Amino acid sequence: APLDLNNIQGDILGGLPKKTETYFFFKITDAAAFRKHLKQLIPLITTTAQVQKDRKAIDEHLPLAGVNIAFSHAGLKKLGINDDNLGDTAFKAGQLADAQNLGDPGTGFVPDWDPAFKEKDIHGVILVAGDSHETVDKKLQEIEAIFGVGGPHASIHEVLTIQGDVRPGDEKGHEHFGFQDGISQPAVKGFDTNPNPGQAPVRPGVILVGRDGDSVARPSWAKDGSFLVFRKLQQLVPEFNKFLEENPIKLPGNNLTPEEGSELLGARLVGRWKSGAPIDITPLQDDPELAKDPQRNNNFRFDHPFADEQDSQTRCPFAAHIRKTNPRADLEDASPTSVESRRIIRRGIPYGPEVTPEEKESKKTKHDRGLLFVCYQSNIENGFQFIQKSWANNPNFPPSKPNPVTPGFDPIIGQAANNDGARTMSGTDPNNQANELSLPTELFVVPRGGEYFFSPSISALKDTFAA
Numbered sequence: 001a002p003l004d005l006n007n008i009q010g011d012i013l014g015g016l017p018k019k020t021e022t023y024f025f026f027k028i029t030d031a032a033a034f035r036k037h038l039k040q041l042i043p044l045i046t047t048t049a050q051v052q053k054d055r056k057a058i059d060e061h062l063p064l065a066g067v068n069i070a071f072s073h074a075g076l077k078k079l080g081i082n083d084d085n086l087g088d089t090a091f092k093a094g095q096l097a098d099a100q101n102l103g104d105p106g107t108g109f110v111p112d113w114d115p116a117f118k119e120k121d122i123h124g125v126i127l128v129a130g131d132s133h134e135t136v137d138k139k140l141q142e143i144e145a146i147f148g149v150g151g152p153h154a155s156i157h158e159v160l161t162i163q164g165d166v167r168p169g170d171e172k173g174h175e176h177f178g179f180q181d182g183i184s185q186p187a188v189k190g191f192d193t194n195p196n197p198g199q200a201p202v203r204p205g206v207i208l209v210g211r212d213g214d215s216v217a218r219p220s221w222a223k224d225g226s227f228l229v230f231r232k233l234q235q236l237v238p239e240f241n242k243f244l245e246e247n248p249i250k251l252p253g254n255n256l257t258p259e260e261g262s263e264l265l266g267a268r269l270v271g272r273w274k275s276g277a278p279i280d281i282t283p284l285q286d287d288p289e290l291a292k293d294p295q296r297n298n299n300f301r302f303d304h305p306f307a308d309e310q311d312s313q314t315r316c317p318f319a320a321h322i323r324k325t326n327p328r329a330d331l332e333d334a335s336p337t338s339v340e341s342r343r344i345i346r347r348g349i350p351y352g353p354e355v356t357p358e359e360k361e362s363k364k365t366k367h368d369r370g371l372l373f374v375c376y377q378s379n380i381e382n383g384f385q386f387i388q389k390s391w392a393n394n395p396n397f398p399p400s401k402p403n404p405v406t407p408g409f410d411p412i413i414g415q416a417a418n419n420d421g422a423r424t425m426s427g428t429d430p431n432n433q434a435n436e437l438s439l440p441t442e443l444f445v446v447p448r449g450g451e452y453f454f455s456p457s458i459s460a461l462k463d464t465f466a467a
């Protein structure tokens with residue numbers, strides 16, 4: 001059947017438009033009151049239908065708020081909602097239980113997370129996205145009132161609030177390392193009806209529980225919901241920059257300046273120039289015109305050369321972040337159902353202040369900043385967990401490579417098996433692809449915690465969650 005976009009929470013398909021976004025992580029302290037309160041929240045919940053209207057209004061221009069809600073397994077238990085058939089071990093077990101296997105640093109095993117993610121019983125998260133702090137703060141006061149926060153009717157307790165902010169000026173839509181984000185998303189069949197060149201279509205059930213392509217009995221209340229993975233990922237920006245500065249690529253002829261060598265290395269760690277121009281299309285120079293053109297900036301698959309050819313890392317290293325997280329032709333030899341199953345929708349936002357002169361000049365992080373990583377999928381095991389653990393953390397992925405090649409770790413998110421995280425990456429020098437680059441002992445991205453949630457449908461919120 002066609003998708004009913006007025007039944008789907010709007011961060012999942014379309015995504016909540018934003019300059020700032022607050023995540024309000026809560027514990028349910030009064031289940032009966034919470035279910036009554038939730039009836040009054042439902043009219044505030046932004047559906048995909050409303051997002052499409054909102055995006056049409058932004059594209060023609062604005063005070064605009066979007067609201068979604070998601071529940072952890074601990075929250076469903078608290079509400080007495082039987083989730084025996086919801087998701088699989090990952091959602092039921094919670095992210096803290098998965099931290100060791102994700103490769104998160106520990107003093108184990110307990111991960112080195114922020115206390116709120118490590119110590120505390122998170123039952124859910126309310127997402128509030130808006131054009132401004134004023135818009136989000138106003139909407140949060142309304143949502144707090146609905147749940148009685150600050151008064152004797154309270155049904156929830158705040159565990160943690162985290163604010164994200166899109167970066168300023170010409171860095172708008174770039175993450176803190178300086179790279180354009182939000183380019184490549186799967187095209188959901190029945191929603192993204194005009195995929196860009198290179199944008200692979202996926203059956204809706206890769207994203208939405210209970211739809212075509214959802215390879216898992218389901219409870220009726222899970223249809224048209226999606227699993228929300230949250231990770232707070234701290235970024236060490238001066239430390240990343242220091243690594244590029246110390247490791248410029250020198251191509252035959254020694255024509256590149258050290259600055260150009262360091263810039264090229266950055267592009268080859270991610271798979272794109274900071275502009276968003278993909279290196280599989282423009283391997284040795286940026287192309288700002290290409291970077292801005294959605295008909296062109298995703299039209300590659302790592303097929304010329306293909307993975308199995310000698311010296312096949314000429315244009316993009318195997319271990320470049322995007323080639324680890326979306327292998328394209330490195331696996332597209334396998335079934336359309338198999339490769340579509342690994343796709344995620346990303347809806348994160350940067351957090352924290354811009355790098356200060358002192359941080360920049362001293363080359364040392366003083367302030368907490370990074371990515372509030374959010375992704376949606378119908379199956380956490382097939383999406384987020386597989387990408388992190390089978391691909392990013394696997395130095396010998398992909399098997400389509402030549403046998404003598406050891407790609408190494410995703411240099412952005414890749415984590416090694418023991419606290420001794422010695423990480424290497426091959427292929428960064430296109431004319432000496434066997435040469436290993438030792439990554440620093442100190443990670444560039446430091447996980448600070450997160451949780452696995454479920455964003456229900458509107459009808460599920462009305463007919464199952466609310467009272």
Ligand code: HEM
Nearest residue numbers: 175179180181182183184233322325326371387388413445
């Ligand atoms: C601070 C942490 C991270 C940074 C700085 C980062 C940065 C980026 C950048 C710059 C892009 C390229 C833009 C694009 O193609 O849309 C990208 C794409 C992507 N990232 Fe990340 N990322 C981070 C964490 C993660 C994590 C934890 C995952 C999954 C486990 C992930 C999965 C992806 C995927 C699937 C893509 C799209 C690949 C494609 O379709 O070509 N990223 N990321």
